[PDB]
Amino acid sequence: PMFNFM
Amino acid sequence: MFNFM
Amino acid sequence: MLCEIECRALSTAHTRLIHDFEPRDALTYLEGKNIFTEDHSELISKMSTRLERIANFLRIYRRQASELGPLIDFFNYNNQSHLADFLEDYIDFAINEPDLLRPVVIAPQFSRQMLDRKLLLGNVPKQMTCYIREYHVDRVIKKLDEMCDLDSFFLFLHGRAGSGKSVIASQALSKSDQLIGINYDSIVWLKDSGTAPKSTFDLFTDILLMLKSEDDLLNFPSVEHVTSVVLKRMICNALIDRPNTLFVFDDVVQEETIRWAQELRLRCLVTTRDVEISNAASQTCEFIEVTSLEIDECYDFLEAYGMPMPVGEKEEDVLNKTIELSSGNPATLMMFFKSCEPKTFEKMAQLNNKLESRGLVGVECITPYSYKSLAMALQRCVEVLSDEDRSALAFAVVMPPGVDIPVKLWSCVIPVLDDEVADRLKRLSKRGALLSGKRMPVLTFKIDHIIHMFLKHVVDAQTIANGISILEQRLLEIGNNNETVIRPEDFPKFMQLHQKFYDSLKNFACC
Amino acid sequence: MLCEIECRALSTAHTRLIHDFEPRDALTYLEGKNIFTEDHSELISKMSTRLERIANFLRIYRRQASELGPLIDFFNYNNQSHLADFLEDYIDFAINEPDLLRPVVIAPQFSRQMLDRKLLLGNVPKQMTCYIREYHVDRVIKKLDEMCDLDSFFLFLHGRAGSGKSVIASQALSKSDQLIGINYDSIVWLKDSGTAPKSTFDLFTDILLMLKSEDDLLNFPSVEHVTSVVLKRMICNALIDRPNTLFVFDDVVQEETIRWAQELRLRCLVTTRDVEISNAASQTCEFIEVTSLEIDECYDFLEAYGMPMPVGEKEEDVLNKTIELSSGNPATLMMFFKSCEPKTFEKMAQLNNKLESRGLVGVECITPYSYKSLAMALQRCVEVLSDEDRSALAFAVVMPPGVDIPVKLWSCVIPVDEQLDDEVADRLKRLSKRGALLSGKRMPVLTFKIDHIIHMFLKHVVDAQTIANGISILEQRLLEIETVIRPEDFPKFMQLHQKFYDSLKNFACC
Numbered sequence A: 001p002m003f004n005f006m
Numbered sequence B: 001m002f003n004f005m
Numbered sequence C: 001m002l003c004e005i006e007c008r009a010l011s012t013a014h015t016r017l018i019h020d021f022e023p024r025d026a027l028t029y030l031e032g033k034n035i036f037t038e039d040h041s042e043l044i045s046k047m048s049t050r051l052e053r054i055a056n057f058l059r060i061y062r063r064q065a066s067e068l069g070p071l072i073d074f075f076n077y078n079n080q081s082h083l084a085d086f087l088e089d090y091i092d093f094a095i096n097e098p099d100l101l102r103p104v105v106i107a108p109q110f111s112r113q114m115l116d117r118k119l120l121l122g123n124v125p126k127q128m129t130c131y132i133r134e135y136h137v138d139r140v141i142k143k144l145d146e147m148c149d150l151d152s153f154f155l156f157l158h159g160r161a162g163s164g165k166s167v168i169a170s171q172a173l174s175k176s177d178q179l180i181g182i183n184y185d186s187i188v189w190l191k192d193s194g195t196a197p198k199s200t201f202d203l204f205t206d207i208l209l210m211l212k213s214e215d216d217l218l219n220f221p222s223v224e225h226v227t228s229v230v231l232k233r234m235i236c237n238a239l240i241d242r243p244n245t246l247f248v249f250d251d252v253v254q255e256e257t258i259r260w261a262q263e264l265r266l267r268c269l270v271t272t273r274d275v276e277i278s279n280a281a282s283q284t285c286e287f288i289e290v291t292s293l294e295i296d297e298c299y300d301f302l303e304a305y306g307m308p309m310p311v312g313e314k315e316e317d318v319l320n321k322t323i324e325l326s327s328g329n330p331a332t333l334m335m336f337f338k339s340c341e342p343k344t345f346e347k348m349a350q351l352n353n354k355l356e357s358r359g360l361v362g363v364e365c366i367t368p369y370s371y372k373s374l375a376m377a378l379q380r381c382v383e384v385l386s387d388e389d390r391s392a393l394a395f396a397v398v399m400p401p402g403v404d405i406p407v408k409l410w411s412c413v414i415p416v417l418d419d420e421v422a423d424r425l426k427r428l429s430k431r432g433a434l435l436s437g438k439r440m441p442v443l444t445f446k447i448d449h450i451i452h453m454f455l456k457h458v459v460d461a462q463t464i465a466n467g468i469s470i471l472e473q474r475l476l477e478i479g480n481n482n483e484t485v486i487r488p489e490d491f492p493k494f495m496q497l498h499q500k501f502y503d504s505l506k507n508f509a510c511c
Numbered sequence D: 001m002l003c004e005i006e007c008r009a010l011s012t013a014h015t016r017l018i019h020d021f022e023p024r025d026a027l028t029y030l031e032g033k034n035i036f037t038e039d040h041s042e043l044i045s046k047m048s049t050r051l052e053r054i055a056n057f058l059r060i061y062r063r064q065a066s067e068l069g070p071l072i073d074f075f076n077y078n079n080q081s082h083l084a085d086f087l088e089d090y091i092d093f094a095i096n097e098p099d100l101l102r103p104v105v106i107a108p109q110f111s112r113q114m115l116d117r118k119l120l121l122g123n124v125p126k127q128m129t130c131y132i133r134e135y136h137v138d139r140v141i142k143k144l145d146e147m148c149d150l151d152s153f154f155l156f157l158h159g160r161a162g163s164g165k166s167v168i169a170s171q172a173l174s175k176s177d178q179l180i181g182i183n184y185d186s187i188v189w190l191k192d193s194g195t196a197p198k199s200t201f202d203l204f205t206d207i208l209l210m211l212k213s214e215d216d217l218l219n220f221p222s223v224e225h226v227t228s229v230v231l232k233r234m235i236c237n238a239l240i241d242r243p244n245t246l247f248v249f250d251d252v253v254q255e256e257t258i259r260w261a262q263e264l265r266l267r268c269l270v271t272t273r274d275v276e277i278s279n280a281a282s283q284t285c286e287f288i289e290v291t292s293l294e295i296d297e298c299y300d301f302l303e304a305y306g307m308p309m310p311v312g313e314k315e316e317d318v319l320n321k322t323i324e325l326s327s328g329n330p331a332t333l334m335m336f337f338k339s340c341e342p343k344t345f346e347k348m349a350q351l352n353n354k355l356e357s358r359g360l361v362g363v364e365c366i367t368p369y370s371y372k373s374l375a376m377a378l379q380r381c382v383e384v385l386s387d388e389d390r391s392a393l394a395f396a397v398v399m400p401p402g403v404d405i406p407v408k409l410w411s412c413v414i415p416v417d418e419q420l421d422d423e424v425a426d427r428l429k430r431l432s433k434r435g436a437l438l439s440g441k442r443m444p445v446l447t448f449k450i451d452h453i454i455h456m457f458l459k460h461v462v463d464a465q466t467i468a469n470g471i472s473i474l475e476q477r478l479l480e481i482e483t484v485i486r487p488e489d490f491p492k493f494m495q496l497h498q499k500f501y502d503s504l505k506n507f508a509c510c
């Protein structure tokens, strides 16, 4: 999941 | 043989 | 044909030429001193009114002559000397006078001609007022003046997100009376913000329509489907009718935008965050970078909308907390004030706490900004990034904010001689002004504070603790090989120096 | 009908037919000499603006009059004699005294601001400035200057990818004031890049519309669906109102383009990578090749964009490394500068490493080139290729770069369907002719050579297996019974180039 949306 | 082309 | 002075002669002499003149009196003369025809005599002899024959003589005479002669030797003949001496006195201050007007002001209310009419019709936003950053807006007005002469050119007003670029061009084109009216005839101000490959084509469609006359906006075709080459040709077509035209391209993302501005030999002011799009243009590319609002200017901005200035030491310090935190940032400074409710230093420090333990989301507000908070803006700045560069960035969390640290001290956390780290870190500062370069004493980089709490509540909750740990590891690996000052190589082995903040970031990831 | 000369006179003289003229004055003087019709005069007498009656008067006239008489015998009678005098001067310095035409009646109206206009409207791209390749832009201008008399012709400006051709046509059409205005009246520069069979038709759709007036760009039909014979007839039609128009066909890949440009008896500058497309044309074909930037010119290009010059010997050597690496290539040189960030020679040799251990992808950047790195470009040169030629190319990796080697030494790694292996050479010729990927050199003995950009292209692009197979398939035939090529008494040992072979092998266990 490394960030958000991103 | 060509890495895609 | 005439010129623009001999035409202004025949033209600005009309409250006169109607009162005492009959064209037939000159007909024969011009039929005779060789300049006229008999289809043109019959053109100007058999007409009902005299305003007829007057418009006739002032449209037909335009052609078969080589200057304004047989209409000044004629009026001196016909007992109507009062037109003659006028026009001969005017060719006097025309020929004998190497000094006349120069493009400026000879009729008042420019500020309703430019300010409202040209700006508004070129879609320029309502310039900022309660504070103007003098330096920058000025260098803008200057650097736009140096180029009004030029055939096609780029001015890149590049900076951070929320950094204030678009506003500065708004103030720089609304201040002067020169850039619009004097230096350039018209203004076209357009927002890009394009990511799809269709955004950069659709853009130049609304330029092309931004140019087109009020007639034929009705006639607007189903133009969405028309080749790229024909839209381009259609713009440089509709561009015949547009001499010295300025283009503001507010918020450019695609280097394709820049290629189009350059295939069409256009003149561009450009607001953008990513600077490398300019390598797309092979040219007199000229650049102006909007740096962070320095600590003193920030004071000025607060002062500006009525915010009370410090006294006690832990209040001037509270305000250096905000200015340090909001790493020189127009936009967030603004989100802050708007969210500072009672206005007290007390509620300002409330926010100073709220900001550390809840991120930019603690202060996101309705602002003149298009984004609720600077994080939504930066997201994009984070999406555009080379996949690997996305990585280096995702990791610079486990650094110290507001601290200069060497290239190898970074080599510990960043993916892959590890100079390659610096290339990624330059690309990272070049592409949204996310980092901070400092060539000497020793090649070192730095991460600011807004740019950190973006990453805090945004990189993966695990990867924070993984970066903290991958660091204590390679650090202790530098351990088994054996203020205005950079950290020495005898002392890299202990980042324990920043133990304080390292302890807070750790309390975050692990819980 | 008129022709290219009388309409070039009518075209050269258009600022004047706009500053003083009116089609109603001539309509009457002309229904009489029999060159019009009552819809013609209908179409031209009722028009709101004058430029409409004028643009229709010069079109209807360019089709209708049996000659260019009743317009000299008219600017004369209507006291606009200052016109018919200019046009009879052009026809006398044309029929009687030729040559004298370009210096005398055409040039005295040049203006370095009309140029920018003609260029912008003809889609000529904005010429390069910080460095100009003298020889080429120049010898190009000369060969364009030499042909304006000609009725139809091809100029083929062919070279490597990123080799700098398009730029040269931009500078070569931005330099003179002669090529546009003096030698040719207008320019239409269209970029091709066509691979599909429809690209070559879509192209000439945009020629046909590049010719077309602003009016009647409103009036565009579904020509996407309209015959080939008709886009063609429509062009040589709509081409009357365009006397001597020069055509740049930037980046031709399909030999179909060249056939169309030649059925339409057109005038063509052609930037291309593959030269054989010229076999399509039965004509005054002339060719001009953009070679790799020589060891010295490269220096000139770096100095040109603010780059600090060597002092120590292993700094002029850092630069002979780049010069060796980008085997003389504008585009990659440019990515090189563009990626040199702090500007130091240090970070330049750094790239010199990154380049050896990661191929062209170590330096891919945003550059004035339409392509991020030279690999996206050569990609195509390699796709278009005859299937067998595709194989030969795939194998010359396991060669030595920047080294001259005989054909039989190539017959070893190179494929074929007896005892004379000449077929190898035919494939390496098609191979250099078609993207300028190799390098042919006739005597002392037929030997070829692969440059470096064209190698590190193949390094990180061919199948990791075919590298190790070529090293071994070579080491088999390998045993049998400085400015010097390796002799037939000593071929059995390619071990001389063991260096550029030990590296390849360290790369084929990776």
Ligand SMILES: Nc1ncnc2c1ncn2[C@@H]1O[C@H](COP(=O)(O)OP(=O)(O)OP(=O)(O)O)[C@@H](O)[C@H]1O
Binding pocket: C128, C129, C131, C132, C133, C160, C161, C162, C163, C164, C165, C166, C167, C168, C251, C271, C272, C273, C330, C331, C332, C334, C367, C368, C369, C370, C377
């Ligand atoms: N003189 C000023 N300079 C900069 N910012 C200001 C000024 N006055 C007010 N602000 C506030 O800061 C906000 C952010 O600035 P702005 O809209 O100019 O950024 P920008 O350069 O358009 O950024 P982005 O590239 O993210 O669009 C403004 O919308 C407003 O809320």
Ligand SMILES: Nc1ncnc2c1ncn2[C@@H]1O[C@H](COP(=O)(O)OP(=O)(O)OP(=O)(O)O)[C@@H](O)[C@H]1O
Binding pocket: D128, D129, D130, D131, D132, D133, D159, D160, D161, D162, D163, D164, D165, D166, D167, D168, D251, D271, D272, D273, D290, D330, D331, D332, D334, D367, D368, D369, D370, D377
């Ligand atoms: N004379 C020059 N001056 C400055 N820069 C140059 C020059 N020639 C080439 N370059 C740089 O190298 C790039 C590639 O050159 P160019 O666009 O001419 O290639 P080309 O010969 O048309 O090749 P292709 O057939 O692949 O298009 C340019 O876009 C520019 O970045």
Ligand SMILES: [Mg+2]
Binding pocket: C165, C166, C250, C251, C271
């Ligand atoms: Mg903006």
Ligand SMILES: [Mg+2]
Binding pocket: D166, D251
């Ligand atoms: Mg090209």
